[PDB]
Amino acid sequence: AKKSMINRELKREKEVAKYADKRTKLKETISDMNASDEVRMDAMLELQALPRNSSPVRLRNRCAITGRPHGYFRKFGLSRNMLRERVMQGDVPGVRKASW
Amino acid sequence: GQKVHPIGIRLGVVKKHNANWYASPKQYSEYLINDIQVREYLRKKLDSAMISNIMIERPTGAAKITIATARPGIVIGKKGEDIERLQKELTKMMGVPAQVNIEEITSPDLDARLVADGIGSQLERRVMFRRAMKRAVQNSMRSGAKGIKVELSGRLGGAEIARTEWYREGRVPLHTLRADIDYASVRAETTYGTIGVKVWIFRGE
Amino acid sequence: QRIRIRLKSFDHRLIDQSAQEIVDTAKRTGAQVCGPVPLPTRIERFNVLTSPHVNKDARDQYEIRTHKRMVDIVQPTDKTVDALMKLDLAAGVDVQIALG
Amino acid sequence: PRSLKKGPFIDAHLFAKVENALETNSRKPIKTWSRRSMILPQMVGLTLSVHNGRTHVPVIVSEQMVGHKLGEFAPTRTYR
Amino acid sequence: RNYGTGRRKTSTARVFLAKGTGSIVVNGKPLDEYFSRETSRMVVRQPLELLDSPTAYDLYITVKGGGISGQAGAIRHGITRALIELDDTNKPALKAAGFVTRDSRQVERKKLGLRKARKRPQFSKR
Amino acid sequence: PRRRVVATREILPDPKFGSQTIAKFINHVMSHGKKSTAERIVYGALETVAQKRNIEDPVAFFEDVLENVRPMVEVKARRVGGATYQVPMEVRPSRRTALAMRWLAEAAAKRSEKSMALRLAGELSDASEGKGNAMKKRDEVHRMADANKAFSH
RNA sequence: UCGAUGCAACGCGAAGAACCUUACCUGGUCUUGACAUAUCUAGAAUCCUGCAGAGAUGCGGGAGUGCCUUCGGGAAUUAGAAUACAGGUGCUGCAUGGCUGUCGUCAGCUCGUGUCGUGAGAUGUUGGGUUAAGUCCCGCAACGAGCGCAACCCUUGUCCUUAGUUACCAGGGAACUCUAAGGAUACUGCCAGUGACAAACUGGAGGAAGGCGGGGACGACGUCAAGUCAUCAUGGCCCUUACGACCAGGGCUACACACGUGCUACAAUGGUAGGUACAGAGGGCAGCUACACAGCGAUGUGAUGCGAAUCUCAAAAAGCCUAUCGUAGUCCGGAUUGGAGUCUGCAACUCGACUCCAUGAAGUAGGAAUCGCUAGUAAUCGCGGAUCAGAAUGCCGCGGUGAAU
């Protein structure tokens, strides 16, 4: 993909890493039943006031090598194209052609 | 485009993976990405010394990289001062010590990657493709390969229409699963485009 | 003190020898050991499109097996534990120790 | 729709524009792009200018439009 | 106490032959209660009855896996394996019936691009 | 196929009569691989006709109706130099039984009785005396064979 | 938005568009730039903040002073000072590499030497058989070889051996199933015939398996200037305060229409309501949840076990027994619409999936035409997984029942 889009994913993940802990504590606060109703309402208001890219939902998994969004595998972290290239070269441990 | 990778189809029957570690489903992706990064860095850096079989096996953080080259002397350096820099550069972009222990190819005419990269270098030196191909065939055959096939594909000699040429000597039986066929595919960036070089070296059973 | 060693790898002919020498070194030190039980290997399959653009009908089917073995030292000895801690096996096989 | 336990959703930036509009009791059409904010009876009576992708079409809010999202009255596609 | 092991497409059964009245207990339950299929009941009781001895041997079957008819086939195979144990003269008759052969038929795998093992999608010339 | 003649499969008999003929008819009634449903349809039909006709052994009655439905001469298309000739030929016994069973099932599938088992029993009864759509189809096939009766190639 | 266009485009790239993805439109913005190297000015980076704005961004206040060498200072680091440049999913698949489809898993396709012909070429490779096969045998101016076929690989079918937990239960046991490694067997091996004294074929025994036991992967030389410059790489052409870059909203989801793939049906071989059974495979800390309570339900709260042969997803459904419906546009069908909710998520209007109540549309078997399938197959029934915060009727698999010819 475009170098701009790769850097855009990087800067989108930077904010996620920067606000990872704040989101966790705030989420526990808003889901706390013992917490006061106005307290959890204000905490949720802050959560909706957080910067947009801080959410781990706007993150799109991309191939590490090519940056391709479509055809991604979590276990390997690469798009289907270069995944096949490296498996066939033998660079990917354990993985081989299957038949049954 | 109708042929299976000779290495890949033989990955479990007679060949072995050139990456021998184990990971957990979550750790495996980052191990693989770091592995590919190290491989591309090595293949760009040691582009002078003819390395062909960099193998990555990482036991519990510490890794044991094993590069096999036809010219270990140049890549090791004087008293071993280039190898230490390579060691620390590997360690910097991996986790913890990457012990790179370096093998030696005692027959560079039987390794497909060395043959392919030699033909590629000759092609980028504006050498006749037919002569480079025939020279590689002769070299491998008289060095003792039971068979060699070399395919040159692209705008050969500046030709506007790309074409595929190839020479075969010996057997090189691709469909035999136990055939011990080394295979390499490289590219020569000439002044008219990319010329693909494929080399099959069949060595036994 | 009944220790349990658990071996997990991708190569099935690596765990066989890894467990073979573990059981041999734990039975040659005057200790009784039960043979390496094999636990059901996990096979993960992947469907990777081979064409770079189109014709979804063409794809490679890959698999990765995760083989697992287990050995138990029913009665341990000091001459078994010392010889076991020196048996530094790695590079392909994960070994987990129950230690009890 | 949404969850009742979560509560009504209104964007903070437009909620500030209406807390700076119902005290003042102005009739200036508040120009907004957040179509994802639900009309609450707090600003019932006044006017907003909701972006429909191309322009900021005017929506005068009424008494029977509360509970809806601001975009419901700003169609984006043109059939004919 | 003759012991037989029978196998079918996915079910595996282990049968225990012992001379008795003719009662058959499958998975700690009577055969009729276990098998609501009349065909399955016949399939289980067939190896006993082709050679004219249904009420001669007590059977203790334990089945696992498979389906209602796969388990019946597995029990038939195991009963044949146990019958050949007490007497080898019954083996020719069992072979002529075709009960000693283990049906190797298995579910054919689904292939790539095919909707099933062999079912392909609709084809259009245009 | 084009080269060999396959060895036919063995069909195990029906559980409640022990007859491969009734088993094969149960197969012809079957759909979606439901042996139990087909078997109860056929058994309901058989018990209905047996209780109505006061016959102790109905397998012989089924053989009688089957041989009554079976045709003997079927018309086959032949090609001789571009001419399509409808030559009447004999029916091999396996095809005889298959055609009879298929005709019985397809005729019983279109009647007006409430249950399919009742429909099948009524059709068996009707073809026993010599009526019903199975009989009409057999008569139609015989009619075409006799209508040609002029090509003995 | 772009590509794919006869077979071999049309549930195709896309293994999953609310934002993101995103490549398109509207508007708001930046110009060595979001990203690499050359550089010199200050600072450890880094953290917490206020306001304005839709956000990108803009203007301000506090804490910290790294580490090794030490007064040259260095791996990283924030804001530019400028030239190189970067960047481009912009164009040319008819300049290309790599990758793929397809004829076609069809049995072919060639070469060396010899010989024949002025020659292009021929022979071999043709012929008699035989085979799934240029498979094999015998003939034969051919003699040989190579890539293809076959075999070697994986899975399943029987047995043996090592092993017995978290697996198993015949009498704690080391029997059995199972699990997962290593092997045994199968070779036309034996018998009878037919066959050129052949290859081979036909039948039979034994055996779990008989002739290629079943399934897969493996795709020759080449053909379509076949597909892909939008995975990637790359020759050339083109744009560099813009065709590059950032943000918000919208669109990719519009529908007089047409076609391609499907799903659900049109019911009685069925619908509904009660009981009662029988799987496999796969997933689970980026989680699955025992159990209890609350709720009509989706779900919610507490809590337990489990990185799993231990705990869980999870109950398999079709099936069987009883009752009922009794052929009706219905107790069939479940679209569409109204209302009220639950989750995921900053956010469900455009434009989510489920839940509940109400509604109840077409549809009663489908024209010309046309498709798949030869056995555990078709048909039918459920169950998993990839992608994935959420979002399968698609894709990839699993087992159940199970034909006709």
PDB file of C-alpha atoms (C1' of nucleotides) in Angstrom, chain G residues 186-298:
ATOM      1  C1'   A G 186      -0.366 -56.077  -1.528  1.00  0.00           C
ATOM      2  C1'   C G 187       4.068 -58.069  -5.182  1.00  0.00           C
ATOM      3  C1'   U G 188      -0.419 -60.278 -10.727  1.00  0.00           C
ATOM      4  C1'   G G 189       2.594 -63.135  -5.037  1.00  0.00           C
ATOM      5  C1'   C G 190      -0.314 -68.468  -5.960  1.00  0.00           C
ATOM      6  C1'   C G 191      -4.343 -71.378  -9.067  1.00  0.00           C
ATOM      7  C1'   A G 192      -7.264 -72.062 -13.818  1.00  0.00           C
ATOM      8  C1'   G G 193      -7.914 -70.425 -18.568  1.00  0.00           C
ATOM      9  C1'   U G 194      -7.314 -66.931 -23.141  1.00  0.00           C
ATOM     10  C1'   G G 195      -2.889 -64.683 -25.457  1.00  0.00           C
ATOM     11  C1'   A G 196       2.683 -64.414 -30.767  1.00  0.00           C
ATOM     12  C1'   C G 197       6.035 -70.108 -26.331  1.00  0.00           C
ATOM     13  C1'   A G 198       4.945 -62.321 -24.890  1.00  0.00           C
ATOM     14  C1'   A G 199       3.062 -57.993 -22.792  1.00  0.00           C
ATOM     15  C1'   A G 200      -1.398 -58.575 -20.950  1.00  0.00           C
ATOM     16  C1'   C G 201      -6.534 -59.841 -19.900  1.00  0.00           C
ATOM     17  C1'   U G 202     -10.553 -62.972 -17.515  1.00  0.00           C
ATOM     18  C1'   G G 203     -12.199 -65.581 -13.342  1.00  0.00           C
ATOM     19  C1'   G G 204     -10.734 -67.983  -8.116  1.00  0.00           C
ATOM     20  C1'   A G 205      -8.493 -68.772  -3.316  1.00  0.00           C
ATOM     21  C1'   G G 206      -6.257 -66.476   0.925  1.00  0.00           C
ATOM     22  C1'   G G 207      -6.522 -61.682   3.100  1.00  0.00           C
ATOM     23  C1'   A G 208      -8.929 -55.769   6.305  1.00  0.00           C
ATOM     24  C1'   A G 209      -7.671 -54.540   1.585  1.00  0.00           C
ATOM     25  C1'   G G 210      -6.752 -57.277  -5.568  1.00  0.00           C
ATOM     26  C1'   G G 211      -4.935 -55.478  -9.363  1.00  0.00           C
ATOM     27  C1'   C G 212      -4.147 -47.637  -9.771  1.00  0.00           C
ATOM     28  C1'   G G 213      -7.693 -50.386  -2.485  1.00  0.00           C
ATOM     29  C1'   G G 214     -10.362 -44.764  -1.755  1.00  0.00           C
ATOM     30  C1'   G G 215      -9.127 -39.299  -1.566  1.00  0.00           C
ATOM     31  C1'   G G 216      -5.391 -35.402  -2.258  1.00  0.00           C
ATOM     32  C1'   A G 217      -0.930 -32.686  -3.467  1.00  0.00           C
ATOM     33  C1'   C G 218       2.248 -32.989  -7.556  1.00  0.00           C
ATOM     34  C1'   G G 219       0.177 -29.649 -13.800  1.00  0.00           C
ATOM     35  C1'   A G 220       5.301 -31.578 -19.685  1.00  0.00           C
ATOM     36  C1'   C G 221       7.016 -28.390 -24.400  1.00  0.00           C
ATOM     37  C1'   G G 222       3.855 -24.901 -25.157  1.00  0.00           C
ATOM     38  C1'   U G 223      -1.420 -21.696 -26.420  1.00  0.00           C
ATOM     39  C1'   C G 224      -4.387 -17.508 -25.396  1.00  0.00           C
ATOM     40  C1'   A G 225       0.542 -10.171 -26.829  1.00  0.00           C
ATOM     41  C1'   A G 226      -4.926 -14.673 -21.303  1.00  0.00           C
ATOM     42  C1'   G G 227      -5.058 -11.887 -15.813  1.00  0.00           C
ATOM     43  C1'   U G 228      -2.394  -8.853 -12.489  1.00  0.00           C
ATOM     44  C1'   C G 229       2.236  -1.930 -13.181  1.00  0.00           C
ATOM     45  C1'   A G 230      -4.070  -1.580  -7.265  1.00  0.00           C
ATOM     46  C1'   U G 231       0.324  -7.201  -3.072  1.00  0.00           C
ATOM     47  C1'   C G 232       5.182  -6.628  -4.642  1.00  0.00           C
ATOM     48  C1'   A G 233       9.431  -5.448  -7.852  1.00  0.00           C
ATOM     49  C1'   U G 234      10.656  -2.850 -12.289  1.00  0.00           C
ATOM     50  C1'   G G 235      12.053  -0.067 -17.972  1.00  0.00           C
ATOM     51  C1'   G G 236       9.940   4.085 -19.819  1.00  0.00           C
ATOM     52  C1'   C G 237       6.234   8.304 -19.690  1.00  0.00           C
ATOM     53  C1'   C G 238       3.943  11.888 -16.281  1.00  0.00           C
ATOM     54  C1'   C G 239       2.801  15.415 -11.106  1.00  0.00           C
ATOM     55  C1'   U G 240       6.240  17.850  -7.553  1.00  0.00           C
ATOM     56  C1'   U G 241       2.360  24.725  -2.464  1.00  0.00           C
ATOM     57  C1'   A G 242       0.346  18.626  -6.154  1.00  0.00           C
ATOM     58  C1'   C G 243      -2.151  13.440  -9.525  1.00  0.00           C
ATOM     59  C1'   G G 244       1.945  14.197  -2.998  1.00  0.00           C
ATOM     60  C1'   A G 245       0.046  14.706   2.607  1.00  0.00           C
ATOM     61  C1'   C G 246      -3.548  15.357   7.034  1.00  0.00           C
ATOM     62  C1'   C G 247      -8.829  15.772   9.104  1.00  0.00           C
ATOM     63  C1'   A G 248     -14.528  15.865   9.417  1.00  0.00           C
ATOM     64  C1'   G G 249     -18.872  14.636   6.857  1.00  0.00           C
ATOM     65  C1'   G G 250     -20.763  11.761   2.828  1.00  0.00           C
ATOM     66  C1'   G G 251     -20.245   7.755  -0.924  1.00  0.00           C
ATOM     67  C1'   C G 252     -18.511   2.637  -2.270  1.00  0.00           C
ATOM     68  C1'   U G 253     -25.259   0.291   0.664  1.00  0.00           C
ATOM     69  C1'   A G 254     -29.119   5.004  -4.762  1.00  0.00           C
ATOM     70  C1'   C G 255     -32.896   1.673  -8.337  1.00  0.00           C
ATOM     71  C1'   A G 256     -37.762   2.316 -14.469  1.00  0.00           C
ATOM     72  C1'   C G 257     -34.360  -2.334 -15.077  1.00  0.00           C
ATOM     73  C1'   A G 258     -31.396  -6.801 -16.861  1.00  0.00           C
ATOM     74  C1'   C G 259     -28.249 -10.906 -15.932  1.00  0.00           C
ATOM     75  C1'   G G 260     -24.779 -14.335 -12.910  1.00  0.00           C
ATOM     76  C1'   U G 261     -24.076 -17.135  -8.293  1.00  0.00           C
ATOM     77  C1'   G G 262     -26.796 -18.608  -4.060  1.00  0.00           C
ATOM     78  C1'   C G 263     -30.359 -18.973   0.578  1.00  0.00           C
ATOM     79  C1'   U G 264     -35.366 -19.606   2.139  1.00  0.00           C
ATOM     80  C1'   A G 265     -39.897 -21.622   0.437  1.00  0.00           C
ATOM     81  C1'   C G 266     -44.323 -23.023  -2.069  1.00  0.00           C
ATOM     82  C1'   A G 267     -45.751 -28.014   2.749  1.00  0.00           C
ATOM     83  C1'   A G 268     -48.655 -33.955   5.257  1.00  0.00           C
ATOM     84  C1'   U G 269     -41.908 -38.141   3.123  1.00  0.00           C
ATOM     85  C1'   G G 270     -44.730 -31.957   6.495  1.00  0.00           C
ATOM     86  C1'   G G 271     -45.644 -27.699  10.647  1.00  0.00           C
ATOM     87  C1'   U G 272     -46.105 -27.336  15.916  1.00  0.00           C
ATOM     88  C1'   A G 273     -45.875 -29.047  21.212  1.00  0.00           C
ATOM     89  C1'   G G 274     -43.772 -32.614  24.716  1.00  0.00           C
ATOM     90  C1'   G G 275     -40.202 -36.326  25.834  1.00  0.00           C
ATOM     91  C1'   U G 276     -35.682 -39.796  24.229  1.00  0.00           C
ATOM     92  C1'   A G 277     -30.950 -40.811  21.714  1.00  0.00           C
ATOM     93  C1'   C G 278     -26.120 -41.117  18.354  1.00  0.00           C
ATOM     94  C1'   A G 279     -20.856 -37.417  15.932  1.00  0.00           C
ATOM     95  C1'   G G 280     -16.610 -35.595  13.918  1.00  0.00           C
ATOM     96  C1'   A G 281     -13.431 -31.695  13.402  1.00  0.00           C
ATOM     97  C1'   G G 282     -11.996 -27.013  15.054  1.00  0.00           C
ATOM     98  C1'   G G 283     -11.502 -22.802  18.341  1.00  0.00           C
ATOM     99  C1'   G G 284     -10.503 -20.544  23.577  1.00  0.00           C
ATOM    100  C1'   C G 285      -5.945 -14.962  27.702  1.00  0.00           C
ATOM    101  C1'   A G 286      -6.867 -10.263  20.684  1.00  0.00           C
ATOM    102  C1'   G G 287     -10.635 -15.550  25.412  1.00  0.00           C
ATOM    103  C1'   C G 288     -14.212 -19.848  26.187  1.00  0.00           C
ATOM    104  C1'   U G 289     -17.144 -19.883  30.228  1.00  0.00           C
ATOM    105  C1'   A G 290     -19.262 -24.453  34.886  1.00  0.00           C
ATOM    106  C1'   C G 291     -22.898 -22.893  38.440  1.00  0.00           C
ATOM    107  C1'   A G 292     -26.421 -19.432  40.837  1.00  0.00           C
ATOM    108  C1'   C G 293     -29.686 -15.445  40.409  1.00  0.00           C
ATOM    109  C1'   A G 294     -32.808 -11.676  37.112  1.00  0.00           C
ATOM    110  C1'   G G 295     -35.207 -11.497  32.563  1.00  0.00           C
ATOM    111  C1'   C G 296     -40.449 -14.138  27.621  1.00  0.00           C
ATOM    112  C1'   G G 297     -35.824 -13.616  25.101  1.00  0.00           C
ATOM    113  C1'   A G 298     -31.305 -11.507  23.082  1.00  0.00           C
TER     114        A G 298
END
